[PDB]
């Protein structure tokens, strides 16, 4: 152990993530290790490990040098299996090993995501400070221009530093939304208290519900404020039966993936195949809005669980998000 | 949504809300600061057309419930013994247009030492002529028996002129009168007048009139006590306007059994906690689906006779 060790290992793992590791130790590990030959390092007698492997084997896991959204029900599951191994390691010998072994044959997004959540929640990651996403995977936080300026630097081997960019809009209150600090927090807040947490993982995040209610109420408030300061008016509430009045072009690009799709203004909400119907929300919204109005949330049995009490708003945040 | 509401947090208030919602229609976000609208006040909604539109909608909300009951049986309607023998209008149903006058005085501000000029307003109101019912009927009963005299005036053709069905038309009927009388052991012939109707109230005494007469009872040693209870529609409104050519409506005389009706207790304008005296639900017995007229038609105590209304121009 140590930390200036644990730490070191981490830094090595998350270095030039888009390419096979250059740190020799990480690679003989990456090669010689077998997550299935001493089911003892694992507190599960390695059921986790044996489940990743099975996938890695039938090679039914998402490919490397490809994109990944945490919203993809499979990509998530895969990402989250790495969490589950890293998670039942008794000590560093087992983490390093895996987050090396996998690091090299699992996709980067799943991997980056897996490592962070794992470091954050697992018993074994106390000493560590995680590098800032913004510098680990800069495509998600950096412009499309600066990114290209950087690819040029590299092509020509001439260094530099480029100035990023952001009178026609409300990309006047932009400084708020596009800040690398907020973006960090926003992701972190959701790594700290993930929507996918099952108490099987080890403990119980306390009031994730009110936490959820609140954190978004404050972005929402903080946001409303900035627009105040800009002769702008408080933000419209979004409706599924209305036009998406205000659209934007992000001018942002994926590393592996392409350029983020843009939205034209005055658009009509389309039923999106694979996710869900527009109406599917409308009804959800109703079911929600009826719990609030009745006084109770009704479970699967037709058991009414009361929410006209203090535990109220969290029970509500559990069903809303 | 009154406050007798079972779950006001859930069923909110359709009808009140629907009153304020129809009125700022002229300024929702209130960028104009227009005052409230005709529909957001009771002395003035009847004015705007959608008033009737919006109440047709609340009406059929109730009709939905109203109509979920099983129609009524023969033994449901009959009040054995009693049998309406004949129904007659003694007089003429003629409706026309009177003229009335109220005073714009509380309207003009006149402060002090500047004196009061009598200004008035003259309006055009509808009217009919008193008429009287000659209800002919024997109480085959050995008894003396109480009786609810229930009389609705339903319609007969369409305005396409299709002619409805006391199904199509049961719900279209307007209550004309409702009164309880004892009917002696045989041939009787009840006579009753436009005037005595229970759903009616005369015009009201003027203000100066009630001033004069209060004033003369001070300097003197008051009973009108005819207008202390208010509920009804104007006597002038009793019958409908009709055609100059005249129309024939259908008169419905249904006599139900007083003892079960009033099985318990003004009582017209229960303003003060006074238990409504009739117990039959309201609109009895045309409030329920009437699938085969075959039935209304074979209870002795129900009788229908066609009347005719004419409008003098
Ligand atoms: Cu969030
Ligand atoms: Cu109303």
UniProtKB/Swiss-Prot annotation, chain A:
Sugar attachment sites: 163
Protein family: Belongs to the tyrosinase family. Hemocyanin subfamily.
Disulfide bridges in this chain: 89-94
Summary of subunit composition and partner proteins: Hexamer of a number of different chains, of which A, B, and C have been identified.
Lineage: Eukaryota, Metazoa, Ecdysozoa, Arthropoda, Crustacea
Subcellular location(s) per record: Secreted, Extracellular space
Role this protein plays: Hemocyanins are copper-containing oxygen carriers occurring freely dissolved in the hemolymph of many mollusks and arthropods.
Note, other: The A chain contains two copper-binding sites. Three histidine residues are ligands to each copper ion.
Domain of life: Eukaryota
TM regions (residue ranges): none
The protein, known as: Hemocyanin A chain
Tissue/organ expression: Hemolymph.
Positions bound to Cu cation A: 186, 190, 216
């Amino acid at each position: 152990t140590g930390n200036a060790q644990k730490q070191q290992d981490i830094n090595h793992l998350l270095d030039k993530i888009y390419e096979p590791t250059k740190y020799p130790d990480l690679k003989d590990i990456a090669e010689n290790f077998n997550p299935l030959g001493d089911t003892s390092i694992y507190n599960d007698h390695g059921a986790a490990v044996e489940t990743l492997m099975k996938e890695l084997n039938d090679h039914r896991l998402l490919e490397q040098r490809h994109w990944y959204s945490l919203f993809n029900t499979r990509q998530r599951k895969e990402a989250l299996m790495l969490f589950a191994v890293l998670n039942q390691c008794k000590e560093w010998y087992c983490f390093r090993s895996n987050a090396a072994y996998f690091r090299e044959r699992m996709n980067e997004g799943e991997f980056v995501y897996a490592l962070y959540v794992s470091v954050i929640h697992s018993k074994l990651g106390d000493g560590i400070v995680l590098p800032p996403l913004y510098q680990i995977t800069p495509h998600m936080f950096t412009n499309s221009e600066v990114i290209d300026k950087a690819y040029s630097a590299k092509m020509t081997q001439k260094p530099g530093t480029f100035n990023v960019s952001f009178k026609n809009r409300e990309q006047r209150v932009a400084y708020f939304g596009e800040d690398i600090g907020m973006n960090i927090h926003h992701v972190t807040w959701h790594m700290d208290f993930p929507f996918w947490w099952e108490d099987s993982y080890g403990y119980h995040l306390d009031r994730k519900g009110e936490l959820f209610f609140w954190v978004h109420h404050q972005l929402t408030a903080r946001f409303d404020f900035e627009r105040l300061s800009n002769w702008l008016d408080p933000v419209d509430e979004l409706h599924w039966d209305r036009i998406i009045r205000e659209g934007f072009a992000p001018l942002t690009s994926y590393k592996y993936g392409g350029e983020f799709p843009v939205r034209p203004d005055n658009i009509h909400f389309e039923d999106v195949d694979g996710v869900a119907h527009v109406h599917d929300l409308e009804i959800t919204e109703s079911r929600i809005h009826e719990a609030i109005d009745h006084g109770y949330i009704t479970d699967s049995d037709g058991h009414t669980i009361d929410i006209r009490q203090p535990k109220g708003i969290e029970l509500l945040g559990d069903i809303i998000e | 949504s009154s406050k007798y509401s079972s779950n006001v947090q859930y069923y909110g208030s359709l009808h009140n809300t629907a009153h304020v919602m129809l009125g700022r229609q002229g300024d929702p976000h209130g960028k104009f600061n227009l005052p409230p609208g005709v529909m957001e006040h009771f002395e003035t909604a009847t004015r705007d057309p959608s008033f009737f539109r919006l109440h047709k909608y609340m009406d059929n909300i109730f009709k939905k419930h109203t109509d979920s009951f099983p129609p009524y049986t023969h033994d449901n309607l009959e009040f054995s013994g009693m049998v309406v023998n004949g129904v007659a209008i003694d007089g003429e149903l003629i409706t026309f247009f009177d003229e009335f006058q109220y005073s714009l005085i509380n309207a003009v501000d006149s402060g002090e030492n500047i004196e009061d000029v009598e200004i008035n307003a003259r309006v055009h109101r509808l009217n009919h002529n008193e008429f009287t019912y000659k209800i002919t009927m024997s109480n085959n009963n050995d008894g003396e028996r109480l009786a609810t005299f229930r009389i609705f005036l339903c319609p007969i053709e369409d305005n396409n002129g299709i002619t409805l069905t006391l199904d199509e038309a049961r719900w279209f009927c307007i209550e004309l009168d409702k009164f309880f009388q004892k009917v002696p052991s045989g041939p009787e012939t009840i006579e009753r007048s436009s005037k005595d109707s229970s759903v009616t109230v005369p015009d009201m005494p003027s203000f100066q009139s009630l001033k004069e007469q209060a004033d003369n009872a001070v300097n003197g040693g008051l009973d009108l006590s005819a207008y202390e209870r208010s509920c009804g529609i104007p006597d002038r409104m009793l019958l409908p306007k009709s055609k100059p050519e005249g129309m024939e409506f259908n008169l419905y005389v249904a006599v139900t059994d007083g003892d079960k009706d009033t099985e318990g207790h003004h009582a017209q304008c229960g303003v003060h906690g006074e238990a409504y005296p009739d117990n039959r639900p309201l609109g009895y017995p045309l409030e329920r689906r009437i699938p085969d007229e075959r039935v209304i038609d074979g209870v002795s105590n129900i009788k229908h006779v066609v009347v005719k209304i004419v409008h003098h121009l």
